[PDB]
Amino acid sequence: AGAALQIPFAMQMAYRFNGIGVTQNVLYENQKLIANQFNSAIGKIQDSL
Amino acid sequence: KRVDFCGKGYHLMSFPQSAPHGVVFLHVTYVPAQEKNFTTAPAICHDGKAHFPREGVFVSNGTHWFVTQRNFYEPQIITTDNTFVSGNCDVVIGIVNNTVYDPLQPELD
Numbered sequence A: 001a002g003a004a005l006q007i008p009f010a011m012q013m014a015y016r017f018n019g020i021g022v023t024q025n026v027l028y029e030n031q032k033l034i035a036n037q038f039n040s041a042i043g044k045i046q047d048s049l
Numbered sequence B: 001k002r003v004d005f006c007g008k009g010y011h012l013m014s015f016p017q018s019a020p021h022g023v024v025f026l027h028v029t030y031v032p033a034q035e036k037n038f039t040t041a042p043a044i045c046h047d048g049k050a051h052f053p054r055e056g057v058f059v060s061n062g063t064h065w066f067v068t069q070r071n072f073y074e075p076q077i078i079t080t081d082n083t084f085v086s087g088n089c090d091v092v093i094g095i096v097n098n099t100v101y102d103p104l105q106p107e108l109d
C-alpha cells in the first residue's frame, strides 16, 4: 500500500493466524513445533520437485 | 476487501462516469504516512500470568508500555479490559515483565 514498515516475523504470523479465526495464543505457545513442521515441509518439497 | 483490485491501498468507494465507448472509475483510497518506529514485545506477564492483547499491539516509547491499534497510533493505558490472560510466562519467547493496572481495586476502596 505505502512505504514498507519493519515488523518481526513472529508477530506477522500471529496476525496471520488471527486472520483465519484461531486466536493468537496458539502461535505463541507452539512456536518450535510450527517451525519444525515448516522446515520439514520445505525440505520435502525440494526432494519431491 | 481483496487488495489491489480497485485502487492502490485501502479502498473506500468509487464513482462511475460515462465515456464515448467505455466507462471511467474514480476510486478513493486511504494511504498512511508520517511513520515512527518503537520498541515492542509479544506479551506482558504480571504476577505469573501472561496477559496478551485482545486486538492491537504493545508498544513502548522507552519508559512506558501502551497498547495501540495497528494502522493508527494513539496510546491507551493497559488495564484488564483490553487484555486477556492465558497460561503463565514460562514458554513464550520475548516476554517482558511489567505491571498491569486494574480498575476494580481503586473503585472498590
Ligand SMILES: *[C@@H]1O[C@H](CO)[C@@H](O[C@@H]2O[C@H](CO)[C@@H](O)[C@H](O)[C@H]2NC(C)=O)[C@H](O)[C@H]1NC(C)=O
Residues within 6 Å of the ligand: B035, B036, B037
Ligand atoms: C527507524 O529507526 C531507524 C534507526 O535504526 C532509523 O534509521 C535507520 O538507521 C539504520 C542504521 O543506519 C539504517 O540502516 C536504516 O536504513 C534507517 N532507516 C531509514 C533510513 O528509513 C529510521 O529512520 C527509523 N524510521 C523512521 C524514522 O521512519
Ligand SMILES: *[C@@H]1O[C@H](CO)[C@@H](O[C@@H]2O[C@H](CO)[C@@H](O)[C@H](O)[C@H]2NC(C)=O)[C@H](O)[C@H]1NC(C)=O
Residues within 6 Å of the ligand: B061, B062, B063, B064
Ligand atoms: C513516554 O510517554 C509517556 C506518556 O506520556 C511519558 O510519561 C509522561 O509523559 C508526560 C507527558 O505526556 C509527562 O508530563 C510525564 O512527566 C511523564 N511521566 C514520566 C514518569 O516520565 C514518558 O515521559 C515518555 N517517555 C519518553 C522517553 O518520551
Ligand SMILES: *[C@@H]1O[C@H](CO)[C@@H](O[C@@H]2O[C@H](CO)[C@@H](O)[C@H](O)[C@H]2NC(C)=O)[C@H](O)[C@H]1NC(C)=O
Residues within 6 Å of the ligand: B095, B096, B097, B098
Ligand atoms: C521480571 O521481574 C521478576 C521479578 O523480579 C523476575 O522474577 C524473578 O527475577 C529474579 C531476578 O531476575 C530471579 O532470580 C527469579 O528467578 C525470578 N523469578 C521467577 C519466578 O521468574 C523475572 O525474572 C523478570 N523477567 C525477566 C524476563 O527478566
